[PDB]
C-alpha cells in the first residue's frame, strides 16, 4: 500500500498578543512526531521517527522548524495588520504538508493551508497561490509571501527533495510497525437494531447491514461497528481481516 506522510500544524490567534502553535506528524495512520507550543523541540512518538537521517542532519532540519515557527507567528500577526479592518481575531490557521509515496521512486508532495476552517492556500511549483473558493483579499498576503524568495527556495527544497528522501528512510525503519498485524475481537449486542462490535484490529481495511466510522483505540488499533436493523433467529455477524489468515469471525 502507498502511504501518506502528513505534518499537521494548528495555530490559534485569540487576539493581537496571545497565540499558540501545536503540531503532529502521521505516516499513514500511525503518529511519528509531536511538537507542542510548550516544547522547544520536535519530539519522537516512535523509536524510528528519525528515519535514516543522521543526528547532524536532523538537528539541521529541526532548527529550520524552530525558526519557522517563531517567524510564522509574527508574520500571521503582521498579515492581520495589513488586511485589517478586513481581518479580525480569533483566527485559526491549519497546515497539512508532506508527501505520498507511490510504487518505485515516485512522490507527490503538498503544503495546504486553511484559514478559519476552510482550505484557501497551497504551495505549488515555485510559489504560493490561492485555491478556488478563496476570498479575494488573500491576494495581498500571497503577493507578500511570494516576495520572499528565500522562503520559496527552502519550501521548494523541503517539498521537492527532503520530504520523499526522509519518508523513504522512515518507511525502512518503520517496516516493523507499519506492516504489523493485530487481530479483531468482536462482541454481539442489540439496542431498540443489532450491533456487531469489531475492535482491536490493524491495519485499517476490514470486511465487517450498515457500517459506521473507523474509531481509534489508544494503543494505535481500530474500532468499527456495523448495525443491522424480531428476526434474529437466523443471523450472526461475520468479519474478514488481514490478521485472521483464512479464518473469519
Amino acid at each position, epitope marked *: 500500500k502507498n502511504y501518506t506522510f502528513r505534518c499537521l500544524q494548528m495555530s490559534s490567534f485569540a487576539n493581537r498578543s496571545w497565540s499558540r502553535t501545536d503540531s503532529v506528524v502521521w505516516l499513514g495512520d500511525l503518529q511519528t512526531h509531536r511538537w507542542s507550543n510548550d516544547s522547544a523541540t520536535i519530539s519522537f512518538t516512535k523509536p524510528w521517527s528519525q528515519g535514516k537521517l543522521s543526528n547532524q542532519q536532523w538537528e539541521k532540519l529541526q532548527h529550520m522548524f524552530q525558526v519557522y515557527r517563531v517567524s510564522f507567528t509574527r*508574520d500571521i500577526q503582521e*498579515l492581520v*495588520k*495589513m488586511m485589517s479592518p478586513k481581518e479580525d481575531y480569533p483566527i485559526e490557521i491549519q497546515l497539512s504538508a508532506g508527501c505520498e509515496m507511490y510504487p518505485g521512486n515516485a512522490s507527490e508532495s503538498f503544503l495546504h493551508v486553511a484559514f478559519q476552517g476552510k482550505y484557501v492556500v497551497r504551495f505549488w511549483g515555485t510559489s504560493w497561490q490561492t485555491v478556488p473558493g478563496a476570498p479575494s483579499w488573500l491576494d495581498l498576503p500571497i503577493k*507578500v509571501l511570494n*516576495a*520572499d524568495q*528565500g522562503t520559496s527556495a527552502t519550501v521548494q527544497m523541503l517539498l521537492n527533495d527532503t520530504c520523499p528522501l526522509f519518508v523513504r528512510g522512515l518507511l525502512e525503519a518503520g517496516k516493523s510497525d507499519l506492516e504489523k498485524q493485530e487481530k479483531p475481537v468482536a462482541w454481539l449486542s442489540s439496542v431498540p437494531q443489532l450491533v456487531c462490535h469489531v475492535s482491536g484490529f490493524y491495519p485499517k481495511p476490514v470486511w465487517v447491514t450498515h457500517r459506521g466510522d473507523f474509531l481509534p483505540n489508544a494503543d494505535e488499533t481500530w474500532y468499527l461497528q456495523a448495525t443491522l436493523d424480531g428476526e434474529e433467529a437466523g443471523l450472526a455477524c461475520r468479519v474478514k481481516h488481514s490478521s485472521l489468515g483464512g479464518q473469519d469471525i
Partner: T-cell receptor
Framework: AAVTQSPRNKVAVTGGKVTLSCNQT?????MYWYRQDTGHGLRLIHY???????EKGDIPDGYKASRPSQENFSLILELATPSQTSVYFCASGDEGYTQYFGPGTRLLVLE | TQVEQSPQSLVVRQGENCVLQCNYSVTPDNHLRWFKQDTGKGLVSLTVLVDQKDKTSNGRYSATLDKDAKHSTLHITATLLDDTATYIC?????????????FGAGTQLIVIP
C-alpha cells in the same frame, strides 16, 4: 523612488503640538517613521500598511501616527518634550524588503 | 542591540584603505545592508548582501557577508575626503515587507586630506 519630508528643520516648545509629514509618490502601501539618536541605530516609532492604518512600533509612546492617504504619513506630537529632540526619518516600501528613506527632519524641543 | 559595529570611530589618511566590521545576533538574517550617512545628510545605500556566503562590490566600496559567523565587513579602497561619513549596518529579518530592519549605531570615518 523618492520620499520627501516637511519640514526639514523644526523648533518647538515643551507642551506644544508638532506635526512631521512625509510624502511619497511611489504608490507604496507601506510607510515607516524612525528616530535617529547618537549611540543608537534608527528606532521604529510607528508604521502604516495603507490608508487608515497606523501601527505601534518599538518606541511608539509619546507619538501618534496618521495615514490620511497612500501618499502622506504624519508623525504627531501633541504634548512635545525635550526628549523628542531628535532627527526623524520617514521611509516607504512595497511588498519587497527594501525601504526607501527620506532626507530627515531635525526637531528641537526647548523649554 | 542585536547589531554591533566596530570600530566606533577611525581616522585614516587619504589614499589608505580601511575595513569596517558588523556583527549581529538578529534571527533570522535575510540580508545585510550598508548605508553611508554624510554629516547632516541622510541614508545612502552602498551595498546589500543576501547569500549565506556573499561578496559584493560597489566601486571603491566592497563587502562580505558570512551568515554562519553572522558577520560582515565593509572595505573602502583608496579613501577620499568625501568618505568622511558615518557608515551604518542594517540587518533585515525577512525577504519581504513583513520584516523589521535592525540598525547598528554606525562607525565614524574621518579621512584626512
Amino acid at each position: 523612488a523618492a520620499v520627501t519630508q516637511s519640514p526639514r528643520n523644526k523648533v518647538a516648545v515643551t507642551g506644544g503640538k508638532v506635526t512631521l509629514s512625509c510624502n511619497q509618490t511611489n504608490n507604496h502601501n507601506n510607510m515607516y517613521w524612525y528616530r535617529q539618536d547618537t549611540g543608537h541605530g534608527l528606532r521604529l516609532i510607528h508604521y502604516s500598511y495603507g490608508a487608515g492604518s497606523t501601527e505601534k512600533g518599538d518606541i511608539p509612546d509619546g507619538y501618534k501616527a496618521s495615514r490620511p492617504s497612500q501618499e502622506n504619513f504624519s508623525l504627531i506630537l501633541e504634548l512635545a518634550t525635550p526628549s523628542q529632540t531628535s532627527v526623524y526619518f520617514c521611509a516607504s516600501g512595497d511588498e519587497g524588503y527594501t525601504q526607501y528613506f527620506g532626507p530627515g527632519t531635525r526637531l528641537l524641543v526647548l523649554e | 542591540t542585536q547589531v554591533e559595529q566596530s570600530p566606533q570611530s577611525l581616522v585614516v589618511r587619504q589614499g589608505e584603505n580601511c575595513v569596517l566590521q558588523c556583527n549581529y545576533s538578529v534571527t533570522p538574517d535575510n540580508h545585510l545592508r550598508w548605508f553611508k550617512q554624510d554629516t547632516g545628510k541622510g541614508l545612502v545605500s552602498l551595498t546589500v548582501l543576501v547569500d549565506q556566503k556573499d561578496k559584493t562590490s560597489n566601486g571603491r566600496y566592497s563587502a562580505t557577508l558570512d551568515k554562519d559567523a553572522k558577520h560582515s565587513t565593509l572595505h573602502i579602497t583608496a579613501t577620499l575626503l568625501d568618505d568622511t561619513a558615518t557608515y551604518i549596518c542594517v540587518v533585515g529579518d525577512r525577504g519581504s515587507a513583513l520584516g523589521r530592519l535592525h540598525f547598528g549605531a554606525g562607525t565614524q570615518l574621518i579621512v584626512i586630506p
